[PDB]
TrEMBL record:
<feature type="disulfide bond">
    <location>
        <begin position="35"/>
        <end position="38"/>
    </location>
</feature>
<protein>
    <recommendedName>
        <fullName>Phloem sap 13 kDa protein 1</fullName>
    </recommendedName>
</protein>
<comment type="similarity">
    <text>Belongs to the thioredoxin family. Plant H-type subfamily.</text>
</comment>
<keyword id="KW-0676">Redox-active center</keyword>
<dbReference type="InterPro" id="IPR013766">
    <property type="entry name" value="Thioredoxin_domain"/>
</dbReference>
<dbReference type="InterPro" id="IPR036249">
    <property type="entry name" value="Thioredoxin-like_sf"/>
</dbReference>
<keyword id="KW-0249">Electron transport</keyword>
<keyword id="KW-1015">Disulfide bond</keyword>
<dbReference type="InterPro" id="IPR017937">
    <property type="entry name" value="Thioredoxin_CS"/>
</dbReference>
<keyword id="KW-0813">Transport</keyword>
<feature type="domain" description="Thioredoxin">
    <location>
        <begin position="1"/>
        <end position="109"/>
    </location>
</feature>
<dbReference type="InterPro" id="IPR050620">
    <property type="entry name" value="Thioredoxin_H-type-like"/>
</dbReference>
<dbReference type="Pfam" id="PF00085">
    <property type="entry name" value="Thioredoxin"/>
</dbReference>
<dbReference type="GO" id="GO:0016671">
    <property type="term" value="F:oxidoreductase activity, acting on a sulfur group of donors, disulfide as acceptor"/>
</dbReference>
Length: 111
């Protein structure tokens, strides 16, 4: 499984609606090109995506898709947002590898 980079509002909409129909967890990495911690977390996020194929892992550039960043009040980066069937389930803020890993494991399992 791969991290899906979302580069438009149309792409965002498609990914979210398809995930919601399939009733699967969505984990979004809110990132920026100039953000050092974000670069550090990129491989960690990609690794988790491979380990959890039942969940959808999305990457959103906050400068590219401002309405989506604004929607979730994302001003700190990286922010990892957990969402399932329209509801925010969790948030990880910063390059905290252990916390991200634990929360993916918690939310991706059968509920």
């Amino acid at each position: 499984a791969e991290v899906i980079s979302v580069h438009s509002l149309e792409q965002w909409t498609m990914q979210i609606e398809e995930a919601n129909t399939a009733k699967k967890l969505v984990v979004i990495d809110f990132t920026a090109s100039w953000c050092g911690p974000c670069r550090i977390m990129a491989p960690v996020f990609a690794d988790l995506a491979k380990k959890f194929p039942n969940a959808v892992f999305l990457k959103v550039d906050v400068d590219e898709l401002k309405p989506i960043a604004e929607q979730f009040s994302v001003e700190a980066m990286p922010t990892f947002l957990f969402m399932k069937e329209g509801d925010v389930k969790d948030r990880v803020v910063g390059a905290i590898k252990e916390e991200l890993t634990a929360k993916v494991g918690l939310h991706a399992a059968a509920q």
